[PDB]
Amino acid sequence: MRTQVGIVGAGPAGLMLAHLLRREGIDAVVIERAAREHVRTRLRAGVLEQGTVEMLREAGVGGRIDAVGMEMHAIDFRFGGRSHRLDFHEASGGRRAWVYPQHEVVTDLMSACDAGDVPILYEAPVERIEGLEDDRARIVFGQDGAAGEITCDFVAGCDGFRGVSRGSMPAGIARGYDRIYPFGWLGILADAPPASPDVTWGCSDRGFAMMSMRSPTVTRLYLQCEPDEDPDAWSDDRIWSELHRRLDVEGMPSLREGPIRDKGVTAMRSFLSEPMQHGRLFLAGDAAHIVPPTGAKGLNSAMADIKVLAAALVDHYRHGRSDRLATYSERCLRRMWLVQRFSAALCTMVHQFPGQNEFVRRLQRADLDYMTGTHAGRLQFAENFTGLPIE
Amino acid sequence: MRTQVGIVGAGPAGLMLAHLLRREGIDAVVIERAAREHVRTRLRAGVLEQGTVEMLREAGVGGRIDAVGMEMHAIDFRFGGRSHRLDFHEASGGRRAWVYPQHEVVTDLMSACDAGDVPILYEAPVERIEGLEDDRARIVFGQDGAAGEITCDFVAGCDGFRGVSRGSMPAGIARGYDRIYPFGWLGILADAPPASPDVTWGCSDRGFAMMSMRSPTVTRLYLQCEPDEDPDAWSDDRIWSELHRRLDVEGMPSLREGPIRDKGVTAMRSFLSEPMQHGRLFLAGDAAHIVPPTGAKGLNSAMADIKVLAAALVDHYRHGRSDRLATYSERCLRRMWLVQRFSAALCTMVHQFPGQNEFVRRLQRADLDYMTGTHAGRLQFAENFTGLPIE
Ligand SMILES: Cc1cc2nc3c(=O)[nH]c(=O)nc-3n(C[C@H](O)[C@H](O)[C@H](O)COP(=O)(O)OP(=O)(O)OC[C@H]3O[C@@H](n4cnc5c(N)ncnc54)[C@H](O)[C@@H]3O)c2cc1C
Ligand SMILES: Cc1cc2nc3c(=O)[nH]c(=O)nc-3n(C[C@H](O)[C@H](O)[C@H](O)COP(=O)(O)OP(=O)(O)OC[C@H]3O[C@@H](n4cnc5c(N)ncnc54)[C@H](O)[C@@H]3O)c2cc1C
Ligand SMILES: [Ca+2]
Ligand SMILES: [Ca+2]
């Protein structure tokens, strides 16, 4: 059970890496703790940066984006009882974002991995990653009750925030930067058409809310809630009540209601670990970093990490240039710290912080006024939201 | 004992107002608790926004700015061991700031008020402001141990953060927004030439420092220190030691030392009160709001308030219309919240916060990288630093 690149985790980062390597003739094996069906149908991300769309297209997995996706040009910020449509397409000088949800991406990537005969082991939790400075690393997993081992030149830690790979970094080398925000998000899908054509952010003093969309007939909505909230405490009526209160404004169509499903609570957390590599182990995606999702940056950052990592592995195996592996972490971190900055700035501006200093609270409205109401503020939002360059 | 506008405080705001009113034939009396030369020589502001410079020139009190002022085009941000010269003249579309210190402004304004026979009462602490909704307001003061009272149509509260006018606002009307930062500034003047032509900000992990200037032979320096710090704990050697450590970088000239004077510790605080008027009382300047001084905004904001207040009083007395007095507070507050935002943003970025969450601390460097290293970041800094528009 030997390969060139062992990939822990068959989420979007791991599948994209396997596919990119396969296209370049580099052998990989993916090892995934969950059932394949469970992985595919996780509902998380909705929105892709333009750089991500280009990357999916260029890797041959973007064919359904035009028909299934929805191109986005503006965010409608609701606050002070008014709509503030920020055209980030214009402000960024023509760059866009797309609704194209994570489960579609993962479906596309699993399809591409299967057609390339990429071996993926499911229901195969990795328990240990060994030999990071040995001549080859060892991935120790269990499957069907029995212990297995993958030996490989490099291990890609693509196993998300609660994976094993980040804790496989030697702790004398790793440094964590971690901030948990004092709220979560209650998220739902609703069989109800979007009330307006733009993704809409309710920056209310009851709390944050969002109306995003999946199709002309399905909306994806979020409500700021208590940290560790019990979804059972939110009847459908309570959910629509807070959504209306936080989003609706005079002169814009009222939010449309419909049957709710996929109700769940997620955390709001900024986390980054340095370095993103050590010896034969390279961390990518949520294993290396997470952000609060207001700015639609996590899957996009994972894809940026994998773009760098795949290219670096190709340079090492095909072109006799191992220096790009050596600078993987340095390059991914420069981008990731700016993404962290932007995701934090959105998070601290649009959510209500319980018991917050009143001056700091009133600056939230100043920040919203400035961001939506000035050329410079709109520019910064637009260039960041549609996706920073990748090195 | 009867006048048209009674002005509490002969700082820059009060003297500017008295002078602007004098030029329009509106009678004012200024009542000041301290001695004249004490007020004149307070060591505070050094830097003026372009708008403030234009205001002084238009008022006939700007003739010395060219002679003893110093036009500024850039801030040199020192961090990560490197110099980062942000040309805000270029990034603001040609606007500037000037070194022209507060004591020179006040000297100019005192001279102009004296030449105009504006009565100014020194060593005359105002005790109470009464009759805000009576047919005329009453300013009760003491001077030479005798009680006095000035009756007026309007009271301009220009008596600074620790004055009496803010507390004369009915407390059921007023709302404060207050945030103290966990550090102060130790400030000095040094008879030492500036080591480089630009005001230089030391954004170091030891704490903030600044090298500003007054002349080719006099520098104005600040060090972040503990809140409520004792200047006695800072020998000259300790002062220069920390200034060198926080400012000097390789490849730029080293800070020059010279004899030190006017050592003092000042607070770092964001405060705003709403509204800025009630009945016949109008607050202006530090009486109404303070900011942490990193961005050189307090005197400039005081002058913005006075520009609006004087024009409103002139419209009321001289063009017969009183709608502009009615909107004084609404207009000054819109500008002032954006000033608060900017001053707060600089303050939280360039000072070390003891025991801060490490993720938030590391965002300080991201904020510095983005501000200095992107067009959008430079634009926003430059437009704000050189001074926002006044309504
Ligand atoms: C509510 C919400 C909304 C979001 N919206 C957006 C958005 O609009 N845009 C965007 O760009 N991002 C968004 N994100 C972030 C995005 O979903 C994540 O950043 C993304 O899932 C990261 O992918 P990944 O492959 O790095 O990790 P994951 O998707 O978490 O995949 C990791 C995989 O590793 C597997 N694994 C775990 N432990 C082991 C183990 N021991 N052995 C083997 N396998 C293991 C897991 O089963 C999982 O399949 C959102 C997130 C949330 C919560
Ligand atoms: C270290 C430092 C650096 C600064 N740098 C800058 C800068 O570069 N640029 C900038 O724009 N701003 C700067 N500022 C801010 C600026 O100094 C203040 O905002 C400015 O002094 C405000 O002027 P004012 O007239 O509103 O109040 P003040 O200057 O405080 O004057 C109010 C007057 O009222 C008097 N008074 C008080 N109580 C009474 C009473 N009961 N009766 C009568 N009179 C009374 C006081 O004696 C005083 O003379 C700085 C401040 C500090 C501390
Ligand atoms: Ca109801
Ligand atoms: Ca009366």
Side-chain angles (χ1 to χ4, degrees), chain A residues 186-190 219-222 239-240 243 260-264:
Chain A
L186 172 72
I188 58 164
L189 283 171
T219 39
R220 147 65 67 184
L221 306 113
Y222 302 105
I239 287 163
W240 293 115
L243 286 169
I260 286 170
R261 51 178 162 100
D262 294 76
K263 179 169 70 153

Side-chain angles (χ1 to χ4, degrees), chain B residues 198-319:
Chain B
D198 301 321
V199 176
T200 299
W201 295 8
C203 315
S204 117
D205 63 329
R206 282 199 69 82
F208 186 64
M210 192 193 299
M211 177 210 76
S212 185
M213 41 196 94
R214 298 297 187 85
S215 74
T217 60
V218 172
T219 37
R220 169 73 161 145
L221 305 111
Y222 303 111
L223 286 163
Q224 173 188 345
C225 63
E226 289 177 2
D228 190 18
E229 172 66 294
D230 184 352
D232 290 358
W234 286 82
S235 70
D236 290 358
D237 182 271
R238 184 189 181 183
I239 289 173
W240 291 117
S241 171
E242 287 298 313
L243 286 165
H244 281 289
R245 300 221 275 211
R246 299 173 190 191
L247 288 162
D248 285 351
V249 299
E250 312 291 44
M252 298 288 283
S254 190
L255 201 59
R256 300 197 175 101
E257 309 173 10
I260 284 171
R261 49 191 156 104
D262 283 278
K263 191 168 69 158
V265 169
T266 49
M268 296 289 277
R269 184 172 186 169
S270 300
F271 171 85
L272 184 151
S273 198
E274 302 172 338
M276 291 175 57
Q277 72 195 90
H278 174 76
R280 292 172 186 291
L281 174 64
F282 295 70
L283 305 183
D286 276 16
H289 42 69
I290 60 170
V291 296
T294 329
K297 294 282 144 276
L299 171 56
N300 289 301
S301 297
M303 296 295 104
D305 292 342
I306 289 310
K307 187 176 184 183
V308 174
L309 184 55
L313 287 166
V314 166
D315 282 340
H316 166 87
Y317 282 115
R318 187 152 274 215
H319 307 254

Side-chain angles (χ1 to χ4, degrees), chain A residues 75-326:
Chain A
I75 300 299
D76 179 348
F77 295 86
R78 307 279 175 92
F79 57 93
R82 302 186 185 85
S83 172
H84 309 78
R85 193 179 170 268
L86 203 167
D87 179 343
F88 59 77
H89 177 249
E90 191 285 314
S92 64
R95 300 198 58 92
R96 291 98 81 212
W98 278 256
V99 172
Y100 190 71
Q102 191 158 316
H103 74 268
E104 302 288 9
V105 176
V106 168
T107 296
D108 295 338
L109 289 172
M110 293 177 77
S111 157
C113 281
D114 294 350
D117 297 323
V118 172
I120 309 169
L121 315 196
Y122 291 101
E123 309 178 59
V126 175
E127 267 112 49
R128 214 181 322 125
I129 300 171
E130 303 177 345
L132 298 193
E133 295 191 270
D134 198 342
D135 49 30
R136 287 182 217 80
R138 302 177 292 280
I139 300 172
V140 178
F141 60 95
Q143 206 192 23
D144 300 302
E149 190 182 79
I150 314 298
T151 292
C152 52
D153 303 332
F154 303 104
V155 180
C158 298
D159 47 6
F161 180 67
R162 303 233 170 262
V164 65
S165 69
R166 185 176 62 260
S168 306
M169 299 272 317
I173 287 309
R175 166 168 192 180
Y177 297 83
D178 190 18
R179 192 245 166 124
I180 299 197
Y181 300 91
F183 39 81
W185 277 2
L186 172 72
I188 58 164
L189 283 171
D191 293 301
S196 298
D198 301 307
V199 172
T200 297
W201 294 5
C203 313
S204 165
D205 27 65
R206 291 202 59 83
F208 182 68
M210 188 188 309
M211 180 209 80
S212 186
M213 58 208 80
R214 296 304 186 247
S215 76
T217 56
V218 179
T219 39
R220 147 65 67 184
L221 306 113
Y222 302 105
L223 285 167
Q224 174 189 349
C225 60
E226 290 181 358
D228 191 20
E229 174 63 296
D230 180 358
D232 284 357
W234 288 80
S235 70
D236 284 11
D237 184 272
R238 190 183 177 187
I239 287 163
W240 293 115
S241 173
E242 285 303 312
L243 286 169
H244 282 294
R245 298 218 281 203
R246 300 174 191 189
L247 290 161
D248 287 350
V249 297
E250 294 279 278
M252 297 293 287
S254 285
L255 189 69
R256 297 280 285 284
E257 308 177 4
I260 286 170
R261 51 178 162 100
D262 294 76
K263 179 169 70 153
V265 169
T266 50
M268 298 287 276
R269 188 167 185 171
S270 293
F271 172 90
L272 183 151
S273 195
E274 298 183 342
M276 287 177 58
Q277 67 192 95
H278 173 84
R280 293 181 181 284
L281 176 62
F282 295 76
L283 303 188
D286 276 14
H289 44 72
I290 57 171
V291 294
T294 326
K297 295 277 140 297
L299 171 50
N300 290 302
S301 298
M303 291 304 97
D305 290 343
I306 292 309
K307 185 179 193 184
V308 176
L309 181 52
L313 286 161
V314 167
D315 285 341
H316 161 86
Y317 280 114
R318 287 190 70 199
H319 309 300
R321 303 260 157 98
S322 301
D323 50 300
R324 298 286 274 177
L325 286 174

Side-chain angles (χ1 to χ4, degrees), chain A residues 175 177-179 181 270 337 340-341 344 357-360 362-363 366-367 370 375-376 379-380 383-384, chain B residues 175 177-179 270 337 340-341 344 357-360 362-363 366-367 370 375-376 379-380 383-384:
Chain A
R175 166 168 192 180
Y177 297 83
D178 190 18
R179 192 245 166 124
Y181 300 91
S270 293
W337 271 113
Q340 288 287 352
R341 174 184 177 282
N357 177 279
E358 291 292 323
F359 172 83
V360 174
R362 177 57 176 81
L363 287 187
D367 283 327
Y370 188 89
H375 180 77
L379 174 62
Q380 170 168 174
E383 299 187 317
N384 273 281
Chain B
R175 177 171 175 179
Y177 300 80
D178 197 11
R179 193 266 162 105
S270 300
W337 273 111
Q340 289 289 350
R341 174 187 175 276
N357 174 277
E358 298 290 342
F359 170 79
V360 179
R362 177 58 180 78
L363 287 191
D367 281 328
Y370 186 90
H375 184 241
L379 195 69
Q380 171 169 173
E383 293 175 343
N384 272 283

